[PDB]
């Protein structure tokens, strides 16, 4: 019925590493079998839901990809993962990820489509600003520097900062 509780209902006290992957196979299985979700696409939401299910943040820092997260804009699937999920986020990032599920993705599409076409973080930085008028630069830079310290993404680390200043 709802990502989070049935993430939730995976848990039980120091599962161990095969209780863990059967977890992570079963829900990758089921959203390329039953949602059609590409298997790259599957893979990082399956290991960032299992990151959320038993408090692995290396895990959760799959679904923090911004290659996966522009996905939000392209599938209804995707982002009904991230909304019913969104909670569960914030609260391992100690509420730092302040930003809307549909914030998120377009500022996720922005950071893949910049790194690709190799655009000077400045850019990217006022770029971020103009779709996300809801929150101040400083609010963008810590969910910035939250995200990229999570996937150890040096070019969104290089955003956050000229945001910080901003």
Not at 2 to 17: F, L, Q, V, Y
Not at 90 to 95: E, I, P, Q
Not at 149 to 156: A, H, K, M
Request: proline share 4%; glycine share 4%; no cysteine.
């Amino acid at each position: 019925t709802n990502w989070a509780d049935w993430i939730m209902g995976w848990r039980t006290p120091n599962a161990s590493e095969k209780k863990m992957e059967f977890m992570y196979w079963y829900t990758r299985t089921y959203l390329e079998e039953a949602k059609d979700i590409r298997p790259d696409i599957a893979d990082a939401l399956a290991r960032g839901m299992a990151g959320l299910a038993f408090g692995r943040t290396d895990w959760v820092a799959s679904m923090l990809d911004p290659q996966i997260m522009r996905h939000i804009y392209t599938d209804p699937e995707v982002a009904r993962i991230y909304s019913e999920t969104r909670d569960m986020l914030r609260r391992v990032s100690d509420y730092y990820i302040s930003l809307t599920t549909m914030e998120l993705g377009k500022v996720a599409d922005i950071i893949a489509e910049a790194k690709a076409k190799g655009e000077n973080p400045e850019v990217v930085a006022r770029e971020i600003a103009e779709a996300v008028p809801r929150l101040s630069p400083k609010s963008l830079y810590f969910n910035l520097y939250y995200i990229g310290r999570s996937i150890g993404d040096n070019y969104v680390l290089e955003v956050a900062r000229v945001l910080s200043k901003m």
